[PDB]
Amino acid sequence: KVKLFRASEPILSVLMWGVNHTINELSNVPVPVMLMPDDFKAYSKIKVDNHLFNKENLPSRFKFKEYCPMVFRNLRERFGIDDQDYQNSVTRSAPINFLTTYDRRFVIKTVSSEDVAEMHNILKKYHQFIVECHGNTLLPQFLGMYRLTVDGVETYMVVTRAVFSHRLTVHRKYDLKGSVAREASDKEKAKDLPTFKDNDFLNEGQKLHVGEESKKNFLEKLKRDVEFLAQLKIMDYSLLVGIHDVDRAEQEEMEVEERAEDGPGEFDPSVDVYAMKSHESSPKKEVYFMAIIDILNPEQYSKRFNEFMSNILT
Amino acid sequence: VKLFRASEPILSVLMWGVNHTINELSNVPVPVMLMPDDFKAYSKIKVDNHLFNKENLPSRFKFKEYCPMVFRNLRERFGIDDQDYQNSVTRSAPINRFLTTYDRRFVIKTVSSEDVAEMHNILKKYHQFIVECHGNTLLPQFLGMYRLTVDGVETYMVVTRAVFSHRLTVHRKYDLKGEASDKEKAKDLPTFKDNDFLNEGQKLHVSKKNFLEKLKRDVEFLAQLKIMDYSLLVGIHDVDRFFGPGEFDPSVDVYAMKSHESSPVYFMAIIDILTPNPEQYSKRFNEFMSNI
Ligand SMILES: Nc1ncnc2c1ncn2[C@@H]1O[C@H](COP(=O)(O)O)[C@@H](O)[C@H]1O
Ligand SMILES: Nc1ncnc2c1ncn2[C@@H]1O[C@H](COP(=O)(O)O)[C@@H](O)[C@H]1O
Ligand SMILES: Nc1ncnc2c1ncn2[C@@H]1O[C@H](COP(=O)(O)O)[C@@H](O)[C@H]1O
DSSP states (O other), X not given: OOOOOOOSSHHHHHHHHHHHHHHHHHTTXXXXXXXXXXXXXXXXXXXXXXXXXXXXXXXXXXXXXXXXXXXXHHHHHHTTOOXXXXXXXXXXXXXXXXXXXXXSSEEEEEEOHHHHHHHHHHHHHHHHHHHTTTTOOXXXXXXXXXXXXXXXXXXXXXXXXXXXXXXXXXXXXXXXXXXXXXXXXXXXXXXXXXXXXXXXXXXXXXXXXXXXXXXXXXXXXXXXHHHHHHHTTOOOXXXXXXXXXXXXXXXXXXXXXXXXXXXXXXOOTTTSTTEEEOOTTXXXXXXXXXXXXXXXXXXXXXXXXXXXXXXXXX | OOOOOOSSHHHHHHHHHXXXXXXXXXXXXXXXXXXXXXXXXXXXXXXXXXXXXXXXSXXXXXXXXXXXXXXXXXXXXXXXXXXXXXXXXXXXXXXXXXEEOTTSSEEEEEEOHHHHHHHHHHHHHHHHHHHHTTTOOSSOOEEEEEEEEETTEEEEEEEEEOSSOSSXXXXXXXXXXXXXXXXXXXXXXXXXXXXXXHHTTOOOOOOHHHHXXXXXXXXXXXXXXXXXXXXXXXXXXXXXXXXXXXXXXXXXXXXXXXXXXXXXXXXXXXXXXXOOOHHHHHHHHHHHHTTO
């Protein structure tokens, strides 16, 4: 029951402390019929000074600001994330790393003041857009926005649902825009899990085999989402593409158990929300994770971007 | 769901405060011993809530808890569970500056800046003493001490275990020191004094052997601390005027004593000891008390 907020860096402990603290407060705050325009200009601020006390893991002094907390609670509900689960993923053990919760469910990115600014501008429209699509979207699902202060330095963070599966392993990833001229630098290509780009993707004849029912529901999301990004005049985002090779993982698992001594391709679509199985007619048995990232030629992109993503599938 | 709904925002800040600090403490490992820094420690939290959660709480306020490790240890030495303490302050607004939790278990006195300084002054020796008497004493049992800042105004408070039962009711008080005013002598709860008590030649029939042995070591300890002006709060519950009458849980009503057989319930403890002849006040109080 006892949380120590132990982390490799103080910032992280403060993060764990803040999510823990703010989620508990929300738990005493009745759940509103609807949201109100002020909820979109609201915030919580807490400043801690702990003298000669409770300093094993937390600094004596820090600040924690949560943006628009009523809105993000409701956003969580819409995306079917229970506050307690969220709270636990962040607090049970330090996030890892751009961070991930220890259980790989939530991404936590550090962002700009301008990003936080941009979140506010698009927030009323984004909330409404999440409602009229019932949370069915390739877009980032935003769960919280925070400003931490440690040693008088301010850090902004945005929490999202993870694109990749919290269990299944990604063996190959791309970041796609659709033009110009994009590839992975010999630097990247020589990393463990290179972020490949379009020309890399096109250049390798890469195709994803998902089957018609899935392809249609995916393309119908992509269409609505990217029109929304066009309306909001947003630009330069990407389609994160993760590929899981089922047989490869099973072998990797087997090699993992043998070493220790000295089911495959399955995922819960309620948790691994961006994941699609490969069509039974696929070369390899694969699992794909696809979503739009980095939303923080306007109507052009919409078309440029959309036509491309549409050609990845079969 | 805890709303911290209360008449005064200061009562809401208090409920929020006790709730927050008790939760925080539940993530703090209980140490093998208190350290000298624990007697110089505090928690401070400043809250600034724009357009949020303002139904019962102010939007801006401060809450400071003095020496939280020491007072949590004091709670344990007084056999009070943290979560019960939290529940008592927090489920419903403290009641009736002098307060009790809605369930009558704990008293909440506003005090002065100098009181808080006096408490810091005596705390180590007060702790050492509670350790030594194994919690058995008529002194006030200090459970927490706090400073609230609301509308830019600081308020200090000291939480104690109640003298009077939180169940059984009282029909007569006494404030013995070794008399009552007119406008007072009309109150529903008449706070009599030594003279009123002698006047009616009353003497609680009792135990008195141990009770007095206790009261003695207590007042000798107040003496060595050069403290004075404290009284003995005495309560009287009429039996005659589910649960039976005269029935109480000694582990909760810790000061309560049922009347002897040969006589025609008494609650008794020492109160108000943050006041500052000391050795002197001691015997006037002890010698006088040893009479009733
Ligand atoms: N309610 C708001 N509406 C629009 N922009 C905001 C709001 N709150 C903060 N920002 C912007 O977000 C960035 C960080 O804000 P601050 O929380 O004051 O550090 C700055 O660019 C602010 O102007
Ligand atoms: N929501 C997400 N889930 C998983 N990986 C991400 C997510 N967002 C970004 N990334 C990856 O993390 C890094 C951050 O992107 P960038 O904005 O280019 O620094 C890149 O390597 C991305 O491939
Ligand atoms: N069932 C299998 N499927 C694919 N590759 C395998 C399999 N078993 C062994 N290998 C590969 O054979 C090499 C030796 O494997 P091991 O038998 O674990 O020494 C490794 O490269 C394994 O990945």
